[PDB]
Design a protein around this ligand. Structure first.
Ligand SMILES: [Zn+2]
Ligand SMILES: [Zn+2]
Ligand SMILES: [Zn+2]
Ligand SMILES: [Zn+2]
Lengths: 115, 16
């Protein structure tokens, strides 16, 4: 069961509302593994709050360090079910253009560029 | 068993 299946729409919108009362500039990001990925490990946690000014290469480098991936392993992020943005892009601009109708920014990761 | 995971500055710095 994915995050969207676990929590209802009403509950997810409330989550986002609550968390941005506390942290008005931080980005609520849902990070999950792509259903078909076997090589990369599932992340310990799903819900992340990330600062506005962090860019995508910084975000991927964080997650790589959390997962202790060795240097030769590939790591790709697919956003909102379709978007592979430039890694130079701050996560705040991604949230502006790619956030879900519930207020979360959904991503999935994999080690293959196809999805 | 709390869902919200914030990245510390320590963690963010170490990325760069
Ligand atoms: Zn408050
Ligand atoms: Zn798009
Ligand atoms: Zn903008
Ligand atoms: Zn450390």
């Amino acid at each position: 069961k994915t995050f969207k299946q676990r929590r209802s729409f009403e509950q997810r919108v409330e989550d986002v509302r609550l968390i941005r009362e506390q942290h008005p500039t931080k980005i609520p990001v849902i990070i999950e593994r792509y259903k078909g990925e076997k090589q990369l490990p599932v992340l310990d946690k799903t819900k992340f709050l990330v600062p506005d000014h962090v860019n995508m290469s910084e975000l991927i480098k964080i997650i790589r360090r959390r997962l202790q991936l060795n240097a030769n392993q590939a790591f790709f992020l697919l956003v909102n079910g379709h978007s592979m943005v430039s890694v130079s892009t701050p996560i705040s601009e991604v949230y502006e253009s790619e956030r879900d109708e519930d207020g979360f920014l959904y991503m999935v990761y994999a080690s293959q560029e196809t999805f | 068993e709390d869902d919200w995971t914030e990245f510390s500055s320590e963690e963010i710095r170490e990325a760069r």
